[PDB]
Copies of this chain bind each other. A is one copy, B any other.
């Protein structure tokens, strides 16, 4: 099964959207569009969360199915977040792996483990540039 990052590549190729194979500095038009898409889904997640809190305040004992609008919007947020990486030509799974390494690694302590190394995303990008 494809990862969610590979699904974004399939989406962008299917609509003729720019999706370079390697890290590519974007024109300002792409950056402003990605901001618009991120702002839309951030506001829609916030709305669904506010809703759920409003329902709990009225005593509601939510069920699993009540989470479906929120789950939806969280997935929309993933979709526009992966999408920005994909249009930058930046393999999202490679960047994620590095942020995951730094995060799982920091999780040994009680805070930083003695030999801890922060996420080196710049290094991931330079490794992506080559093939």
Contacts and interface: CB of A to CB of B under 8 A. Distances in A.
Interface string A63-87: 1111111111011111101101100
A35 B29 CA distance: 29
A29 to B, nearest CB: 10
A95 to B, nearest CB: 5
Interface residues of A, number: 73
Dominant SS among interface residues on chain A:
helix
Contact of A68 (B26, B82, B121): B121
Given A28-B53, A31-B53, A125 B11 contact: no
A38 B42 contact: yes
Given A31-B49, A75-B99, 14 more contacts: A4-B96, A7-B104, A11-B107, A32-B49, A38-B42, A39-B42, A64-B125, A64-B126, A64-B129, A71-B88, A72-B99, A72-B119, A77-B81, A81-B81
